[PDB]
Structure 1
Amino acid sequence: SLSEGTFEVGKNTFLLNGEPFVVKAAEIHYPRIPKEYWEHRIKMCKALGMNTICLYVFWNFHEPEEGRYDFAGQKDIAAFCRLAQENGMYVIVRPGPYVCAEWEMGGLPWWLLKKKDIKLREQDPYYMERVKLFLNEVGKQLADLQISKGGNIIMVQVENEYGAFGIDKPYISEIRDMVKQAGFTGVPLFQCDWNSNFENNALDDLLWTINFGTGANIDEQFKRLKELRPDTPLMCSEFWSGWFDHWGAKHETRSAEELVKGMKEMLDRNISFSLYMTHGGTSFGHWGGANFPNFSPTCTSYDYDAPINESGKVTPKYLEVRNLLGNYLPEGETLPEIPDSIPTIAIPTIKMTEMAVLFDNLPHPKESEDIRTMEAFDQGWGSILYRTSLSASDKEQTLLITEAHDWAQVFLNGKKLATLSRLKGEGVVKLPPLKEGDRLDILVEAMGRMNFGKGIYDWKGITEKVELQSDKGVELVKDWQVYTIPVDYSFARDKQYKQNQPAYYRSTFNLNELGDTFLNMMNWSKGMVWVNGHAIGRYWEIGPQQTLYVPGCWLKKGENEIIILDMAGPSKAETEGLRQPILDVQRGNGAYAHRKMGEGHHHH
């Protein structure tokens, strides 16, 4: 076997193979970076002056269906770690089960919600059992990569900021035991929390660390920790810097100044850290999360205004941090060279030739007397259509959908009547006089499940009931035909394309030269996109994001295929490839209630 290296918690310092070592880590999310660019992004982190990469492990990404573990291709976290080792970069693993990170349900799998009374992030028998099985799989993948086994992994995390969730040491203790039983026994295990709550779940046999963002007061952050443990090395597990967007909210950026300063204060005290988002990348497909308690979906782009932008390019911020770090290098040391950027191409207008109307391409219906959530129909992602028939009526009636989780379109005999957005907490629809048998269609699109606090308990579809009010009172609407519309590329491809309402659009285009491009979705309403089978992510006319990053590595010389699922109908069925992204263009009326639009001068 390979020789055994070590990483230890020393006296006021970390020791890498017996020598003091300051962890200068780059936070990276392997699911948000095309597997073909992992190497490139790793090199960018290296030339930046980082010596370590911190990796959250996204549970639902690897086990989208109970029992169906996946660690191949984009999900091959071992491959990423090896790539990291091949570039002399150490790794710190945060194996979940919960990771937050503005990701779908904070990393927890939707199928856990199939158990109505499931209790998350505590010793619920079913939850704990799945956590143990998931961790064991992660162990089979990364345990042999611990530094103690010739690998590059120096530390492993126990849970994630539990202090901001509750107080349950027995739970944390069991999680710790599972991590150890999973195979991670050769390196130190650590906890991370806030200066104001780390004592609530702090275990004595574990390293304690603190998380905070730009503008924090270093001394005020570690003051208490030094008291409890005078000899413990200090580490800001996650230094949050930058800004991630939300649909319907103004785009923002953070100054390189404040960052460089914050990073210098810690460096000047030999305080270890992980720049929370050295490279954000993209929340491809349906993986983006959402804010809690006020539902707010994050944009597809996870640029974060990080040193390394979404497409992996150098930014003024990169240079400023690279130059800063370049000073704290060992005596007689030179920073590695900055890798060349990936070329960008502009693709000429692509006209969607084929079109397939969703209502004319429905899967088999699931029949249900009462309303049930999407998960109750064994679906975790995509859209879900609740259809029924209504009795005749002479006068107008009103429909109250009690919690269309996320975004719904309501149709009467195919004609759109209304659009209800969870961002505004809407739920009422006006019905005109009805004829016996009129068809009521309620198409509910599920966006990301909230990823913070109790937001993880986020059921999609219609959560409780649908009520009809008439001159005779209010009654529940029952007897439903339920159609689950999955996000699988396979489902989007298998449609009756031919040649207002929800539809799949398709077209092929030829390329003679490759490179990264940004699809202009300015002509479209809302939905998701696939290019050569890859799920590029969601888009929404309201912005701030208007383009979708498409990696050149997912493009091919010759014929390329693009499929777009548009929910409300485009202004024009065509898109184009730009060489620059659009992340600061908003459209339409406020997507949120005025008190959250953050602006008031002369409304009305």
Structure 2
Amino acid sequence: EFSVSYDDRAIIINGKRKILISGSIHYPRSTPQMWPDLIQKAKDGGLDVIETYVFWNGHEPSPGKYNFEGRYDLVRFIKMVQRAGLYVNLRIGPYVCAEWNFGGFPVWLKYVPGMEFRTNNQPFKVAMQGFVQKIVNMMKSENLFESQGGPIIMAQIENEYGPVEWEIGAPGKAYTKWAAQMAVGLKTGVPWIMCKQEDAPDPVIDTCNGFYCEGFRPNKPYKPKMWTEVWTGWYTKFGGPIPQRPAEDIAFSVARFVQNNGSFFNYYMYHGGTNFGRTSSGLFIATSYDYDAPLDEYGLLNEPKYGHLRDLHKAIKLSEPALVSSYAAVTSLGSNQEAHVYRSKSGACAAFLSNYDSRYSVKVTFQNRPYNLPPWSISILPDCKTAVYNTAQVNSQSSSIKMTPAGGGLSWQSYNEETPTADDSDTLTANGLWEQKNVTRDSSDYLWYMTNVNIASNEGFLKNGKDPYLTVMSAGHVLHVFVNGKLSGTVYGTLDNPKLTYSGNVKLRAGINKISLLSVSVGLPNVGVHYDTWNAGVLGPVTLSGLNEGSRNLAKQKWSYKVGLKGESLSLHSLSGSSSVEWVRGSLMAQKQPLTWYKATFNAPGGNDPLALDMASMGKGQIWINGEGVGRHWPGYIAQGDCSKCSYAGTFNEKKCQTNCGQPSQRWYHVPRSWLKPSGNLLVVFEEWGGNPTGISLVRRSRSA
């Protein structure tokens, strides 16, 4: 009925070789009502395939219970791509990286007895095969593979394992062989792929990720050349800038790939979207996953990038009959110039004329005709005679972003978060320090490390003008130090270095002194060899210096623990949770105070424009609207890095075109209209650092010229 195969040239769909233009759109980083519009714009962008990861931890929060409703409705998403007449590349994983919490793995998976992530491990294999098996079965049951008449033309198993296999050695090769054998053994009827897998076993095709992938070649001569990730920009991290990749560079890199035998490429990302809630983003990754994608975070067209790529795809589609019926033949044109010519026995001719010089514009002669090639550009001649397209020459409209305030300020109400201290009636205690994930299981960002310090009256610092010295070392990621219910200092880390040290003088009086430590995790690591084994939270050393005794090792004593916030267990984020009205309705009330809840009621602004929250007046925490988590906020973390002016021309790197530095890492936070009633919308903000609620504004996202 239907079939998907491959050869040395391309992917074969229904007996025909296909040059496939793909774009990556992750379903849980958007709302179910946004999906149709995003998929439509992708279709209009010239994409044949929609690519997406499958997010395990979002699907299986409990060892047994599954979730496939709301924006985690994977089956809804794929059927929507079908209704748009497009194909799907399903990158299953289960490891997805994706700047996604814990790399996509559920946190409970770590605590299954004898477990080891991404290796020749029995508990892992069982767990891995179970979920992968479930996903394939679900896809079959709704007839979603191309062989059944569905959109799914290929699937990915694992993500960029090559580098890990290298470091871990023999268990790595065994697991790879297993993973491949297992995946293919599921009889999907469609080919399987593996990115960054130089030794992917047959019949799995190894693919390429990166900014450029033209020099790439598969591990077998009978396997097609595929680029699973054309990085359209880079992710944003809290503390970091907003990176961008120029459209002219992307188009050049794509052209370099197509001209040189490349038959499949995928834009990572085509739509980046948002990291809603507290289980989406990876370690220190911002809520915004804009990625400088052709479709911005809010689903608006990122111009000129969208249109310029749309024109590129039109040129490739015009060149397609030749591309599938011939191979790339190189003819030198000059010192830094080449012509890749696709000449069919039928007589079809497509030519790509390149200029790799990034300094000067160059003129070449191809088949008696002159061509002017801008620096660092490729011209496409679909008929071999006339150049319809050039990668450095944008004929699409540019546009800027404006955030227009909608309505006015809100009447705010405030609730204080308690500062818990160690009691003798505490059940969850230990004679030392515990790791944060071990305790919280990522059910909350917050964990309280509590202990009591007894200060004898014969102490030296009490009689004279001396202060005791406290040193608290944490593995990450934010630490708040409270002595006797009062804040003594705050430290926070970076993505590269999340480990923390607090140091300072403390106010200790005679008797029992209570120490309260609040340890916050800002997402979990998603990449790295043995990344799951990395620590979070206060594990010491924890010392109290300046006593009659030299220095007291506070790590070696009884510690109480409390998971989450009193504000969380009371479920203050939802409307039915915000019932314990200990809310200060005060005309004059809470402002710039740590650990504070806020709530206001608003009406949905009149129009079609997408919405955000200007939170520049605030510090850090998380946001809910009508019970649904908008995600974390951290406008208090200012963007760091070198942010020079950049030219499209020349080799790109993540740091080449960085913007928004000396500014809040993220200021506006995406609010889907899909989440709003016409009136009586509940807006709950937990403010961890301290900020002014009256400053918070609802804004309208508009782009033009």
Q: Distance in 2 between matches of 1:528 and 1:504?
A: 10
Measured in 1, the distance between the counterparts of 2:210 and 2:6 equals 21
Query: 1:385-435 CA distances to partner (integer Å, 9 max, x unpaired)?
Result: 122221126433333333242111111122110112132633223223333
Aligned residue for 1:428, secondary structure, equals strand
Which residue does the alignment assign to 1:171? 175
Aligned: 1:475 with 2:559: no
- Encode CA deviations 1:27-63: one digit per residue, 9 max, x unaligned: 1111111121011111111000000011111111111
User: For the residues of structure 2 that align with 1:550 and 1:512, how far apart are their CA atoms?
Assistant: 12
The SS at the match of 2:428 is strand
Q: CA deviation at 1:546?
A: 0.7
Alignment partners' CA distance in 2, 1:552 and 1:202 = 44
Change in Cα spacing, 1:6 to 1:468, as seen in structure 2 (3 Å) is: farther
Cα separation, 2, equivalents of 1:512 and 1:473: 59
Amino acid at match of 2:429: S
Change (3 A) 1:66 1:468: farther
Give 2:455's aligned residue: 392
Alignment CA distance shift 1:491-1:578 (3 Å): closer
Q: How does 1:93-172 map to 2 (within 5 A)?
A: 93-114=90-111, 118-143=115-140, 144-167=143-166, 168-172=172-176
Q: What is the CA deviation profile of residues 352-380 of structure 1, one whole-angstrom value per residue up to 9, with x for unaligned ones?
A: 53222221799996521222123322531
User: Counterparts of 2:264 and 2:319 in 1: how far apart (Å)?
Assistant: 19
How far did 1:512 drift?
5.7
Task: Please tell me whether residue 569 in structure 1 is matched to residue 686 in structure 2.
Answer: no
- Verify the 8 A CA contact 2:207 2:226 in the aligned structure 1: yes
Over 3 Å counting, the alpha-carbon distance change for 1:463 and 1:94 in structure 2 is farther
Contact 1:100 1:106 in 2 (8 A): yes
Deviation at 1:576, TM superposition (A): 0.7
Matches within 5 A, 1:270-309: 270-290=262-282, 297-309=284-296
Instruction: Answer with 367-376 or 442-451: which moved more.
Output: 367-376
Letter in 2 for 1:328: I
Residue aligned with 1:34, SS: coil
What is aligned with 2:360? Answer: none
Q: 1:572 to 1:553 in 2, by over 3 A?
A: closer
1:160 Cα offset (Å):
0.9
CA 1:345–1:177 in structure 2 vs 1: closer, same or farther (change >3 Å)? farther
Moved more, 245-254 or 494-503: 494-503
**Of the candidates 230, 235, 240, which is equivalent to residue 249 of structure 1?**
240
Deviation of 1:556 (Å):
1.8
Q: Judge conservation of contact 1:355–1:505 (CA < 8 Å) in 2.
A: yes
1:227-284 superposed Cα distances (whole Å, 9 cap, x missing partner): x523321101212221221111222322111011112222334521111101101111
C-alpha separation between the residues in 2 aligned to 1:298 and 1:344?
23
- State the partner residue of 1:429: 503
| Contact preservation (8 Å) 1:404, 1:420 | no
CA contact 2:165–2:173 (8 Å) conserved in 1:
no
- Residue 77 of structure 1 aligns with which residue? 74
Q: Check whether the contact 1:266–1:272 (CA below 8 A) recurs between aligned residues.
A: no
Aligned pair in 2 of structure 1 residues 350, 173: CA closer, same or farther (>3 Å)? Answer: farther
Cα distance, 1:438 vs structure 2: 2.1
Aligned with 1:507 (options 591, 600, 603): 600
Find 2:214's aligned residue among 192, 210, 218.
218
The match for 1:338 is none
Q: Secondary structure at the match of 1:351?
A: coil
Question: 1:507-548 CA deviation, whole Å, 9 max, x = no partner?
Answer: 111236254211010111100100112211111122221110
Contact 1:398–1:428 (Cα < 8 Å) also in 2: no
Residue identity matched to 2:256: E
The answer as to whether partners of 2:191 and 2:203 remain within 8 angstroms in 1 is no
Q: Does 2:311 align with 1:312?
A: no
Secondary structure of the 1:519 match is: strand
d(CA) in 2 for partners of 1:443, 1:377:
13
**Do the aligned partners of residues 101 and 387 (structure 1) sit closer, same or farther apart at CA in structure 2, a change above 3 Å counting?**
same
Matched, 1:190 2:193: yes
Are the counterparts in 2 of residues 347 and 517 from structure 1 also a CA contact under 8 Å?
A: no
1:368 alignment partner, one of 429, 440, 461: 429
CA distance in 2, matches of 1:567, 1:13: 53
Aligned CA RMSD, in angstroms, stands at 2.8
Counterpart pick for 1:538 among 625, 628, 632: 632
Identity of aligned residues (%): 27
SS in structure 2 of the partner of residue 376 of structure 1: helix
* Residue 461 (structure 1) shift: 2.8
Select which of 552, 558, 580 maps to 2:673.
552
Sort the Cα spacing of 1:283 and 1:258 in 2 relative to 1 into closer, same or farther, 3 A: same
1:525 is the counterpart of 2:524: no
1:329 to 317, 328, 331: 317
Range that drifts further, 487-496 or 398-407:
487-496
State TM-score, norm by structure 1: 0.85
CA distance 1:184–1:420, shift in 2 (3 Å): farther
Bigger fraction of residues in helix: 1
Quote the residue 1:585 is aligned against. Answer: none
Determine if contact 2:544/2:554 at 8 Å carries over to the other structure: yes
Label 1:489 to 1:65 Cα distance change in 2 as closer, same or farther (>3 A): farther
Query: In structure 2, what is the Cα distance between the partners aligned to 1:522 and 1:147?
Result: 48
The alignment status of 1:450 with 2:544, answered yes or no, reads no
Corresponding residue for 2:376? none
Unpaired segments of 5 or more residues in structure 1? 292-296, 334-342, 583-604
Indicate conservation of the 8 Å contact 1:114/1:375, yes or no: no
> Are 1:113 and 1:459, in contact at CA under 8 Å, matched by a contact in 2?
no
Query: What is the letter of the counterpart of residue 564 of structure 2?
Result: I
Q: Output the CA distance in 2 between the equivalents of 1:573 and 1:366.
A: 40
- Which of 1 and 2 has greater Rg? 2
The offset of 1:549, in angstroms, is 0.8
Do the aligned partners of 2:416 and 2:597 also contact (CA within 8 Å) in 1? yes
Q: Report deviation, 1:14.
A: 1.3
Indicate the larger mover: 488-497 or 473-482. Answer: 488-497
